[PDB]
Amino acid sequence: LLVVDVTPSFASLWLVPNINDFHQRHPNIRVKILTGDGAVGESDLHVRCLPLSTHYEYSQLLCEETLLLIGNTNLPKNQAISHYPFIPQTTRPQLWEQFKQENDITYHSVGFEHFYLACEAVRMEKGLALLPDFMAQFSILRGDIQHIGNLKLHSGYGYYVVIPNFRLTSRKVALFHDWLKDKLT
Amino acid sequence: ELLVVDVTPSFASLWLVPNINDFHQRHPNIRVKILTGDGAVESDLHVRCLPLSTHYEYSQLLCEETLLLIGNTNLPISHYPFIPQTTRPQLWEQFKQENITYHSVGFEHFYLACEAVRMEKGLALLPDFMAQFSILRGDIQHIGNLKLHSGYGYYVVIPNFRLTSRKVALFHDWLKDKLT
Structure with missing residues (x-):
């Protein structure tokens, strides 16, 4: 089980429409989709919309x-x-x-x-x-x-993937992240 | 005037957005901001979805x-x-x-x-x-x-500082008209 926490709209307008493609790749990984838009324990990976910056902390820009x-x-x-x-x-x-x-x-x-x-x-x-x-x-x-x-x-904003430090080497997390990068670069 | 309401994420998109023009039909001068939340009850009025109970203190059942x-x-x-x-x-x-x-x-x-x-x-x-x-x-x-x-219901919660507020009462009356 992978728990992801993404913005309310990222969830309905993009992730639910697209997640079938992730499941095609990795059928064994069930996903719980949570929503949130605040500051970043329950989730394994978050997606947040933030002003473009290099100074965020276990994060990687998905797309502007x-x-x-x-x-x-x-x-x-x-x-x-x-x-x-x-x-x-x-x-x-x-x-x-x-x-x-x-x-x-x-x-x-x-x-x-x-x-x-x-x-x-x-x-x-x-x-x-x-x-x-x-x-x-x-x-x-x-x-x-x-x-x-x-x-x-x-x-001037971007969508960032933000990963809890201990999840930086989690396989399920790296697979979802790479998938996100593939679809949204 | 501005009225700020805080309702569940789905109450907002699936019911309130499609219906709120009827409220503005009644009260065209009241601007609205729609916030979403689903936790414990800033806003002028809240709608939450709770198990049906007669023991809530100041929550008013809108509809089962x-x-x-x-x-x-x-x-x-x-x-x-x-x-x-x-x-x-x-x-x-x-x-x-x-x-x-x-x-x-x-x-x-x-x-x-x-x-x-x-x-x-x-x-x-x-x-x-x-x-x-x-x-x-x-x-x-x-x-x-x-x-x-x-076994759940939709409840309206009016905060203690809005107990005499006209715009809040008008919005609540409208909700009751539409959903009760």
Whole structure:
């Protein structure tokens, strides 16, 4: 048994869609998926979203965070973008301010802590959201949401694998980590 | 005004996000921030899922939990794996007492079980009100009209500093209107 602890949205928007491929590779390893977004005993490996840095401590960068502009599949295909409400993500308020800077507003009246909630709000046609590319990928593929106007944002964040010191030589952990690296480099 | 609510991860995505526009229809001036949590009860109002009890001090029962048997929209039940939810290790046995082979992954949260169903990983048990819109929009389906009264309930907790707060009372009244 491998216990992994990953962000609430990393879990539903990427890991659950992709984990079948890990099980194809290593059928003998059952996985318990926990969720969390705070500071990093129960889990064997964590995935967290942190400002890009070299000074974190048993960690390895999986991938830099690149956000896509997403909207409902009903939206038609420059700054007609401004006609739609922007969905606030309350943990990441700089994102829309940065977007206003990558380019160029009414904010939707509900703000959300997590990407997966913002994604659900886009499915509810409440406005546009910024979602990490790898998280949007399956949802776009299956027709839940669409990428609006090929617009993106480099946020200055990354997804890191963080491993408890005693797990640094655990085989199950190194196998999952290598798998993550393979899919998300 | 801003109202901050703290509800379970799945209550948020599977019910509150699809429904909250009805609240704004009633009260368009009240902005909302939706936080998620599932531990012991910052926020103006909490929704938690607890075993049914009449001994809670200041928790108000919103609705009892009725779980539906859920599968993917392309299901035409023994042939399918059951998706385990680790915080509720008894549920499948207990479902099976009304009338084996679990999936090799996860989860503590309903919203993860729901995604697993979408990923064709097996069958899940999901609260009826949480399944409702996902069923409507064709993400999932209810299998065989099968259900389970789980013994849990959804409780609203109003913190002691919000006891006279209009925005909190309005939101609570709305929840009761929709779910009780």
